[PDB]
Copies of this chain bind each other. A is one copy, B any other.
Amino acid sequence: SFTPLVVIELAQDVKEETKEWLKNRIIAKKKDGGAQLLFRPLLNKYEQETLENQNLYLVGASKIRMLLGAEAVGLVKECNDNTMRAFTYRTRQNFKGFDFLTMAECQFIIKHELENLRAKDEKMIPGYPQAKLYPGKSLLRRLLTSGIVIQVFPLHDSEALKKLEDTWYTLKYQPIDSIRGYFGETIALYFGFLEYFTFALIPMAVIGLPYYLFVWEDYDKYVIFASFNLIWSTVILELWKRGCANMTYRWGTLLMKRKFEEPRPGFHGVLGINSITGKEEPLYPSYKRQLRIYLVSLPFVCLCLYFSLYVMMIYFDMEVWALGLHENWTSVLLYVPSIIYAIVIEIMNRLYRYAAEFLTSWENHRLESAYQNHLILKVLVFNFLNCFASLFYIAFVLKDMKLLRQSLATLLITSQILNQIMESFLPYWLQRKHGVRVKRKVQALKDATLYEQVILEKEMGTYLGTFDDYLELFLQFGYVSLFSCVYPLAAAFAVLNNFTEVNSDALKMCRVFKRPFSEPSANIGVWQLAFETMSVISVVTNCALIGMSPQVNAVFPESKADLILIVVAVEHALLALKFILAFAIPDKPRHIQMKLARLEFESLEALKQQQ
């Protein structure tokens, strides 16, 4: 038998008609339609005498098949002449690494082939007339939608994971290239950004430290810190682009033209010939998708954003009712509105995410990258508003810096400690307990090594995505760039949390969730726009907070109109300089730009020779 890489779990009582049909499509050659992979059940006929196979099936492929699949996805690898080119089976000897493809790459290729399994003449899933099919429809999608296939997931490499673990937690630089090799470009990019952002916050943590310790509340002192803050915000987000470009080029994912990739299983449409790639795949009119975006999805997001402000106002009206009652058991009643609002926020965030996931799926995006960018953008604007609208209200409407400091202190200390317990420490404790339980059950049987590994990973938690992880750092960047003049220790507590966040998130990836399917990402996606918008908002925030300070208002006792005009002029000058600085700093280093240019030139010379 083969090396098992991907597991497919089928429902409770799936018909044999369906099982054999699914087996045929996963085994049959691509010429006859269907992936040319290998299919086998978790347990053999001999071991099925005791341990019955609970409709769990293992998927693998040939060494030649894997290399042909690597060409299909367009994996870029380094050649002997140190140039990065897309892999081809005919040109396999020219590649430097040629153990060539990692397990993560192998499992991604298998996932890609299973996702591109499309219905030919089948009018339904055999045995299930309710689960109707049409030419071009993704089989894996229809199987998951109907509920015939419960889940498809890649298997962990216990020995490889343990080797990475020892080089990961502990003191030195994070092994981003090792994380890439096991989890993929997307997960390694997150741990690469986390390590970078922690180092990026260090200057702001060191500069902000004497502002708290010696209580520096002067005009000159605040202007110096805010000026440094605005320069820091631009320079770190610009230097990240350059650093990411170096890393993704080395990986080869930067040279990948992801726009020509095959559509996601969730993409529906009339089967036809693609105008660009020439592939027989589903076709959906862009205007239908655009109308759903701007006429249904956009007004819904705006309604939820308005409702968020409406709910926030109820909390600030509830804090008035609670303060009046305390002024007239009362000390307990003061905590009550903060407890209620925080609970309502959690109810709102879980409900909006279901509505956002539905609408982005309904929008019908062709590529997974597009679906992700649109889904992140929807959930992010809602999560940002619910988190910062109350903070902005205290700072600029209430103008209560004592309450704002206490609000930020809860968010940066108590909330981050509780977050780490809920995020990885508690789920790890619970997963470790399940791990012993399963291990003991297998010992009592009297070779179920792979059986135990599949049963364990099957019931393990599914990693939802890098969104929740990046959002933590986005909100961190929010408190630091916006209110560092109010709370100078903002960056100090951000670095302290991030010092344990690397260890906690690693533990969450290794011993909590089952292996997530690798995605060849070339950047942090729509997060770059999000972080850059936050650095633009920080100009407005820092200029307002300085203009609001009683030190500046002492200079302008009557002429308050003049003061605002000066502040607005300074704000406009800073916003212009911020854009010039971002334009002046190239998003890619010189050597990467030249390497990308020579490859661009080669493609044009190749097209002239081929025609």
Contact surface of A with B, Cβ cutoff 8 Å: 85-86, 88, 91, 94, 257, 259-260, 275-277, 286, 540, 560-561, 563-565, 568, 572, 590, 594, 597-598, 600-604, 606-611
Query: Which residues of the other chain, B, contact A565 by a CB distance below 8 angstroms?
Result: 564
Task: Choose among B561, B601, B604 the residue that contacts A564 (Cβ–Cβ < 8 A).
Answer: B561
Q: Which 3 A-B pairs have the closest CB atoms?
A: A560-B561, A606-B606, A603-B603
Cα distance A257–B603 in the bound complex, in angstroms: 11
Beyond A276-B594, A560-B561, A564-B564, whether A260 also contacts B607 by CB under 8 A is no
* B611 and A91 contact, CB distance less than 8 A: yes
- A556 to chain B: closest CB distance in Å? 9
Query: Which residues of the other chain, B, contact A563 by a CB distance below 8 angstroms?
Result: 561
Cα distance A540–B383 in the bound complex, in angstroms: 31
Cα distance A606–B600 in the bound complex, in angstroms: 12
* A611 and B275 contact, CB distance less than 8 A: no
* A572 and B540 contact, CB distance less than 8 A: yes
Cα distance A260–B602 in the bound complex, in angstroms: 11
Beyond A561-B561, A565-B564, whether A602 also contacts B598 by CB under 8 A is no
Query: Which residues of the other chain, B, contact A600 by a CB distance below 8 angstroms?
Result: 257, 260
Query: Can you identify 15 A-B contacts, CB atoms within 8 angstroms?
Result: A86-B607, A88-B608, A88-B611, A91-B608, A257-B604, A275-B594, A276-B598, A540-B572, A561-B563, A561-B564, A603-B606, A606-B606, A606-B609, A606-B610, A606-B611
- A94 to chain B: closest CB distance in Å? 7
Additional A-B contacts beyond A85-B611, A560-B560 (6; CB < 8 A): A88-B608, A94-B611, A260-B600, A276-B597, A568-B568, A606-B611
* A603 and B607 contact, CB distance less than 8 A: yes
- A252 to chain B: closest CB distance in Å? 14
Cα distance A602–B257 in the bound complex, in angstroms: 12
Query: Which residues of the other chain, B, contact A607 by a CB distance below 8 angstroms?
Result: 85-86, 602-603, 606
Task: Choose among B260, B286, B564, B598 the residue that contacts A275 (Cβ–Cβ < 8 A).
Answer: B598
- A71 to chain B: closest CB distance in Å? 8
Cα distance A602–B277 in the bound complex, in angstroms: 8
Query: Which residues of the other chain, B, contact A604 by a CB distance below 8 angstroms?
Result: 86, 257, 260, 603
**This chain's copy number in the assembly:** 2
* B601 and A277 contact, CB distance less than 8 A: yes
Query: Which residues of the other chain, B, contact A603 by a CB distance below 8 angstroms?
Result: 603-604, 606-607
Query: Which residues of the other chain, B, contact A598 by a CB distance below 8 angstroms?
Result: 275-276
Cα distance A601–B278 in the bound complex, in angstroms: 10
* B86 and A608 contact, CB distance less than 8 A: yes
* B564 and A276 contact, CB distance less than 8 A: no
Query: Which residues of the other chain, B, contact A594 by a CB distance below 8 angstroms?
Result: 275-276
Query: Which residues of the other chain, B, contact A259 by a CB distance below 8 angstroms?
Result: 597
Query: Which residues of the other chain, B, contact A88 by a CB distance below 8 angstroms?
Result: 608, 611
Task: Choose among B257, B286, B606, B610 the residue that contacts A590 (Cβ–Cβ < 8 A).
Answer: B286
- Name the residue among A275, A540, A610 with the largest chain B CB count within 10 angstroms: A610
Query: Which residues of the other chain, B, contact A568 by a CB distance below 8 angstroms?
Result: 564, 568
Query: Which residues of the other chain, B, contact A609 by a CB distance below 8 angstroms?
Result: 606, 610
- Name the residue among A590, A601, A606 with the largest chain B CB count within 10 angstroms: A606
- A80 to chain B: closest CB distance in Å? 12
Chain B residue with Cβ nearest A277:
B601
Query: Which residues of the other chain, B, contact A564 by a CB distance below 8 angstroms?
Result: 561, 564-565, 568
Query: Which residues of the other chain, B, contact A257 by a CB distance below 8 angstroms?
Result: 600-601, 604
Chain B residue with Cβ nearest A590:
B286
Cα distance A611–B603 in the bound complex, in angstroms: 10
- A174 to chain B: closest CB distance in Å? 31
Query: Which residues of the other chain, B, contact A610 by a CB distance below 8 angstroms?
Result: 606, 609-610
Cα distance A485–B609 in the bound complex, in angstroms: 59
Cα distance A323–B145 in the bound complex, in angstroms: 84
Cα distance A563–B509 in the bound complex, in angstroms: 53
Cα distance A94–B610 in the bound complex, in angstroms: 13
Cα distance A563–B572 in the bound complex, in angstroms: 18
Query: Which residues of the other chain, B, contact A85 by a CB distance below 8 angstroms?
Result: 607, 611
Query: Which residues of the other chain, B, contact A590 by a CB distance below 8 angstroms?
Result: 286
Chain B residue with Cβ nearest A275:
B594
Query: Which residues of the other chain, B, contact A260 by a CB distance below 8 angstroms?
Result: 597, 600-601, 604
Chain B residue with Cβ nearest A564:
B564
Cα distance A323–B220 in the bound complex, in angstroms: 43
Query: Which residues of the other chain, B, contact A275 by a CB distance below 8 angstroms?
Result: 594, 598
Cα distance A339–B156 in the bound complex, in angstroms: 83
Cα distance A286–B598 in the bound complex, in angstroms: 17
